[PDB]
């Protein structure tokens, strides 16, 4: 479970994991399964004496 960084699936090792800021979702297109987890989006968090 150390193999995260951005690419893995139970059926295949993920090749791409797009970040959909709009819905705040993580999508893996080539099979079809949210890798789960949206950590609160870095694109939402891209506006942020002696």
């Amino acid at each position: 479970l150390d193999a995260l960084p951005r690419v893995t699936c139970p059926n295949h090792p993920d090749a791409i994991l797009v970040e959909d800021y709009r819905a705040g979702d993580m999508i893996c297109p080539e099979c079809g399964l949210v890798v789960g987890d949206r950590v609160i989006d870095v694109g939402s968090e891209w506006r942020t004496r002696t």
Binding site: D25, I27, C28, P29, E30, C31, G32, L33, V34, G36
Partner: protein, 576 residues
């Protein structure tokens, strides 16, 4: 500060548990829709495009469910995501073969929100149990919520720019839970004051008054037109009310068609017309004015609100009891549809003509004021002579201020009563006042005749300008204008001085309103935090969170307050 972080001051308690954000919710401005059934709510397509439901796949609808998956996010009747039994979820927007994608029974599919779905709707601020109700959605154009007028009534919503909030449950228990409880039809009667909460109002109430008129006659063509408007109908055309010289139907006949056919509500016409009794008994020439319906058939009587609802003796309460919420809701939606359509064709307006009264009476009214003006002077001079007699237990000033007040009240009332007489029944304003809508005689006085005395805490305008109100007045002036009396009408206009006194009182209403608005939220909180500790038990005894008994049984009977009703025992009859 570690204690502070917890402490409540935006802490774990108040700043998190007592108030947080949730999903599957929407809020917009509100718009009216009398055409909507009482359970309907109008819903924006974008919201419907935004809102979804995750349904678990069953073999009975799996093929359709698969079509939603196949339809996908690219249209409203499709689905955004599917959640597999093992827990895996799929984005169909980026799925390479959304239509070809496999699926089976037991999987969950996140499909778009559809019509006919039950949601929970709320006012904000929330003040009572009817303030949150389960509703049926209606998907519509433009980002507006459309609602039935009568649903505004428990909500007290205003389309001036109010927003209200809606929540969509995602569990079938809760869908049942909302359906069996949160749904509006059960909310009709309040247990707080064993009365109905629904109320047909304004345009609808006015046209109903208009519709009860004796001069109401219909044509066969329009009867068919009216019949189609019906949300439900027997399919059997009724017999004409008139056959000769020409076949005709009455509005009372047709209103009675709307009425369910084996229930009656009796007498409470509750209108000014007739004679505070005694007179209408003269001789039972007992019809028209007084209300009476038999076997779902209206015999006579112009309708009112006390008949129409939110009061004791109302038709609405008894229909709820006999016909139940479900039949009563369909009757109510139906009547509103019909009355609206009749109103639409009948029409209603208002103009300066409605402000017109008789010149001579209007001439008499001013002269009535002139005598009262003269009457004040008689009172002023006697006091200045110190020949005026002080009222027992009061000072001479208290008597004087009281005495001038009776005169300013008697005259205004007299001149008002002249205006009540001076207006035709033809008038929209009298029509609006009589129907039980937003008006009254005092309004007529204010618009046509006289606004009356302005006061500070009930007292005449104080001498803030050094024993005076204004430098336009003489010193030691005691005229009613010098103390805020608005003699003119809204039609007559106001003097510069009267307008100012009028502006001042408007502040008193407004300031009190703002202060009252903040405080009620606070007082309630004090109230709720106390009363939250108690609930009813299965042994009928009323108990608290530590199971101790409050009462032997709730309300000393254990019965529902809604099932209670106003009755005369009459056993306290005078003569034994």
């Amino acid at each position: 500060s570690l204690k502070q972080r917890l402490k409540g001051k935006e802490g774990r308690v108040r700043g998190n548990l007592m108030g947080k954000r949730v999903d599957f919710s929407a809020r917009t401005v509100i718009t009216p829709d009398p055409n909507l059934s009482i359970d309907q709510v109008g819903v924006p397509r974008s919201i419907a495009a935004n809102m979804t439901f995750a349904e678990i796949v069953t073999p009975f609808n799996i093929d359709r469910l698969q079509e939603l998956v196949r339809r996908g996010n690219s249209q409203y009747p499709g689905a955004k995501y599917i959640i597999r039994d093992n827990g895996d979820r799929i984005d169909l927007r980026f799925h390479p073969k959304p239509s070809d994608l496999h699926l089976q029974t037991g999987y969950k599919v996140e499909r778009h929100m559809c019509d006919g779905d039950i949601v929970i709707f709320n006012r904000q601020p929330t003040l009572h149990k009817m303030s949150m109700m389960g509703h049926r959605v209606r998907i519509l154009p433009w980002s507006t919520f459309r609602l039935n007028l009568s649903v505004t009534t428990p909500y007290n919503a205003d389309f001036d720019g109010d927003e209200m909030n809606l929540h969509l449950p995602q569990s079938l228990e809760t869908r049942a839970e909302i359906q069996e409880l949160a749904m509006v039809p059960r909310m009709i009667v309040t247990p707080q004051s064993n009365r109905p909460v629904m109320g047909i109002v304004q345009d609808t109430l006015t046209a109903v008054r208009k519709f009860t008129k004796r001069d109401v006659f219909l044509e066969r063509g329009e009867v068919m037109n009216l019949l189609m408007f019906l949300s439900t109908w027997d399919g059997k055309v009724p017999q004409p009310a008139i056959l000769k010289p020409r076949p005709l139907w009455t509005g009372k006949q047709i209103f009675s068609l709307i009425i369910p056919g084996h229930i009656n509500c009796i007498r409470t016409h509750s209108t000014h017309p007739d004679d505070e009794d005694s007179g209408p008994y003269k001789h039972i020439s007992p019809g028209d004015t007084k209300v009476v319906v038999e076997n779902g058939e209206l015999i006579m009587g112009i309708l009112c609100k006390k008949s129409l609802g939110t009061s004791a003796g109302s038709l609405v309460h008894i229909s709820y009891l006999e016909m139940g919420h479900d039949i009563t809701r369909l009757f109510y939606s139906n009547i509103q549809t019909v009355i609206n359509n009749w109103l639409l064709i009948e029409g209603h307006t208002i103009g300066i003509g409605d402000s017109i009264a008789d010149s001579k009476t209007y001439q008499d009214i001013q002269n009535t004021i002139k005598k009262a003006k003269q009457d004040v002077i008689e009172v002023i001079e006697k006091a200045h002579n110190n020949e005026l007699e002080p009222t027992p237990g009061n000072t001479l000033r208290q008597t004087f201020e009281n005495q001038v007040n009776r005169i300013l009240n008697d005259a205004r009332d007299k001149t008002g009563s002249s205006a009540q007489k001076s207006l035709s029944e033809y008038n929209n304003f009298k029509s609006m006042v009589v129907s039980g809508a937003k008006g009254s005689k005092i309004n007529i006085s204010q618009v046509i005749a006289v606004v009356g005395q302005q006061n500070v805490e009930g007292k005449r305008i104080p001498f803030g300008f050094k024993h005076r109100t204004l430098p336009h007045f003489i010193k030691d002036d005691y005229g009613p204008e010098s103390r805020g009396f608005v003699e003119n009408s809204y039609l007559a206009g106001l003097t510069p001085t009267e307008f100012f006194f009028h502006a001042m009182g408007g502040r008193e209403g407004l300031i009190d309103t703002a202060v009252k608005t903040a405080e009620t939220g606070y007082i309630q909180r004090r109230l709720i935090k106390s009363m939250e500790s108690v609930m009813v038990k299965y042994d009928a005894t009323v108990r608290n969170s530590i199971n101790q008994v409050v009462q032997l049984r709730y309300g000393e009977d254990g019965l529902a307050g809604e099932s209670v009703e106003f009755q005369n025992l009459a056993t306290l009859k005078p003569s034994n």
